Amino acid sequence: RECISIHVGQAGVQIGNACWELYCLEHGIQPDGHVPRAVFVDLEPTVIDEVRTGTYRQLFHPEQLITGKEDAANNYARGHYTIGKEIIDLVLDRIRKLADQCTGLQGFSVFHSFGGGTGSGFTSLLMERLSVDYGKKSKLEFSIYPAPQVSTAVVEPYNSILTTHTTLEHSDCAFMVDNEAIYDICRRNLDIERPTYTNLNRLIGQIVSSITASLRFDGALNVDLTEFQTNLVPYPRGHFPLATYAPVISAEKAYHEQLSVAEITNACFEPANQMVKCDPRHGKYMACCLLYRGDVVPKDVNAAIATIKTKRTIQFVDWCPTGFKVGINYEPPTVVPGGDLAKVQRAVCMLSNTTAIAEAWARLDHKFDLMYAKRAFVHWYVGEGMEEGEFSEAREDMAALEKDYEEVGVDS
Ligand SMILES: Nc1nc2c(ncn2[C@@H]2O[C@H](COP(=O)(O)OP(=O)(O)OP(=O)(O)O)[C@@H](O)[C@H]2O)c(=O)[nH]1
Ligand SMILES: [Mg+2]
């Protein structure tokens, strides 16, 4: 029934504090109410401390807040092997101590930031140690994969080609939200050149609320977590769909809010609104899980979608007749009291697997090579319990992820 969550890496923790905020906010549980149902991991104390100093301070147990005073290191190796190792046990312990206390759970919603040290590496083995300790569950990892041109870390790819290959054979469904492609939404669909990280977080903090929160919440067309991976992954590769939200209108500027279904659903497939720089440049969808929430008439959907199924310029895979999982919830969304999110009475958090990422992975793989081609910051990992193996052998890994996402599509 439940779904634990492990927010790993400063980012996964910032986003965590955010997604965790939106929660109580739409459940009437102020600062000090019940008890969360997740944990927080980081090898840099000062960040988890922010959850220990700032807002939502006492809504957590100093037990579900793991820290390694030591060093973060923007390098996979160190975070996965060398350092990150020391903490893992302890980490697990909570996701085994928190996993027990419950009643027939469904899985762990993992929150990490692909291209980091504590986020890429660590998790790599966290999800790793999970796939074995609970192979019998769902492993949906919600990632924030590398901005297409606006990356931060100098190494980023090293850290992301490595978190992909190690987690690939362990996740159930990996959701992806592109940090940059979300900015566009903040520039083009909300207008603000002042987007603090605290915003992107409010956003995913939204799209995510549509996943677990409301879905695990009764409705006219419930959709379990398992449901996802089933209706969402055509193949064992921990396939990565993309998150998209519909009413991303500004709560100040424009106001046409009352945008009946027929509109908000069409607003999902236009590439300028998908929290991912993977513009459907060719990527044929192969399965979409349209999660609606608020006042929505099933016919409105079983029509708004029909209209789409016949737009053709939206070309769905061949081997897939119908790939539209319609998830209907009741309670409308719940916008921050005064952030910058419109606040409509219905939304569409549609996520999907698109042959599109054939790109995004490509462009991120290429990156890697360029540097590896010169070993660049390699000495930083080797000296951290890794080898020419793990790199070269994780490169070959993704290689067959560029072929995979190619074969499962583009062909009939
Ligand atoms: N959406 C979003 N992205 C974030 C946030 N914080 C960081 N990121 C992104 O995630 C990546 C940064 O990872 P870091 O903060 O360097 O590292 P970490 O993953 O926390 O772990 P360490 O490297 O060991 O510190 C960059 O690509 C950032 O753009 C956040 O609050 N929200
Ligand atoms: Mg950090």
Considering every ligand atom, which ligand is closest to the CA of 148? 1
Domains of the chain listed by start with CATH number = 1-241 (3.40.50.1440), 242-356 (3.30.1330.20), 357-412 (1.10.287.600)
d(CA 90, CA 93): 5
Ligand 1 atom at shortest distance from the alpha carbon of 18: 31
Mutating to test ligand 1, I would choose from 144, 381, 384 the residue with most ligand atoms within 8 A of its C-beta, which is 144
State which approach was used to obtain the coordinates. Answer: cryo-EM
Query: Does the CB atom of residue 73 touch ligand 1 within 6 A?
Result: yes
d(CA 368, CA 165): 13
In sequence order, what are the residues at sequence separation of 6 or more whose Cβ sits closer than 8 angstroms to the Cβ of residue 411? 318
Q: Which of 382, 360, 7 is nearest to 161 (CA)?
A: 360
Resolution of the model in angstroms: 9.4
Q: Please name the residue whose Cα sits nearest to atom 12 of ligand 1.
A: 116
CA dihedral 363, 190, 263, 242 (to 10 degrees): 30
Query: Does the CB atom of residue 74 touch ligand 1 within 6 A?
Result: yes
- C-alpha distances out from residue 98 to 3, 42, 105, 154, 215, Å: 10, 18, 10, 36, 21
Q: How far is CA 236 from the centre of its chain?
A: 18
d(CA 22, CA 206): 7
Place of tokens 């009946």: 260
DSSP string, 110-161: EEE-SSSIIIIIIHHHHHHHHHHH--SSB-EEEE----SS---SSSTHHHHH
How many C-beta atoms surround the C-beta of residue 73 within 10 A? 21
d(CA 107, CA 96): 12
Helical spans, DSSP H, in 197-338: 197-215, 225-232, 261-264, 266-269, 298-309
**Cβ–Cβ < 8 Å for 241, 172:** no
The tokens for 3 are 């779904």
